[PDB]
Amino acid sequence: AARDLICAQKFNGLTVLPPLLTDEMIAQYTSALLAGTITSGWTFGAGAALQIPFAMQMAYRFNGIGVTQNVLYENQKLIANQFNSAIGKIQDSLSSTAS
Amino acid sequence: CGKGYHLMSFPQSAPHGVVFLHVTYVPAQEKNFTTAPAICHDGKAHFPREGVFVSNGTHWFVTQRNFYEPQIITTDNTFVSGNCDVVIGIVNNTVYDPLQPELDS
Ligand SMILES: *[C@@H]1O[C@H](CO)[C@@H](O)[C@H](O)[C@H]1NC(C)=O
Ligand SMILES: *[C@@H]1O[C@H](CO)[C@@H](O)[C@H](O)[C@H]1NC(C)=O
């Protein structure tokens, strides 16, 4: 009794094809990328994946940006607290603001 | 440019375009090791300068990141910072000093 525009545009030949990649396997790709970038560092993007503990990988990233790795290991809990608070803040930012 | 760490590139002419040859570096054969973030000796902490601490199970070696060559832990390739009570997972081993056998003789 209340016709929407989808049926009206469907009855004039304007169809919409479905995408080949649905959201399940896109989510599988993102899960694989997250698992690689946590448990392998940046080695999996060049050759094969190698296991590295996460604190040593963060020490490598700090040595990359210009801070020697003794600053990390004496301040690891502060880094973890700030990271958890940042993830919670960005979750609240996506929950509140819709723009 | 290519899959892996990059070394060079060679262009080649083509009809209506260009063809590249990205020579690249790929590691091949792997080996498991047991690591530790630092080495405790005399109450102070030793860290790798440019490398990583590995162990085969009996001895501890310092090794560069993308190729396996073992080296003895010395004061020349390590720098000291802090104590042993703030790092997590530190193991106990000696630290060699090259000045001691020179002063002994
Ligand atoms: C290292 O140990 C794991 C655990 O069993 C094993 O699956 C793997 O084949 C070993 N070797 C390499 C190169 O990862
Ligand atoms: C290293 O030696 C100290 C005493 O020299 C000891 O208290 C400590 O537990 C040792 N480390 C480990 C991992 O056992």
UniProtKB/Swiss-Prot annotation, chain B:
Domain of life per record: Viruses
Intrachain S-S bonds: 40-84
Known outcome of mutating residue 29 to H: In strain: Kappa/B.1.617.1
Sites carrying sugar chains: 32, 56, 92
Function comment: Subunit of the fusion protein that is processed upon entry into the host cell. Mediates fusion of the virion and cellular membranes by functioning as a class I viral fusion protein. Contains a viral fusion peptide that is unmasked after S2 cleavage. This cleavage can occur at the cell membrane by host TMPRSS2 or during endocytosis by host CSTL. In either case, this triggers an extensive and irreversible conformational change that leads to fusion of the viral envelope with the cellular cytoplasmic membrane, releasing viral genomic RNA into the host cell cytoplasm.
The protein's name: Spike protein S2'
Region of the whole protein represented: 1043 to 1147 of 1273
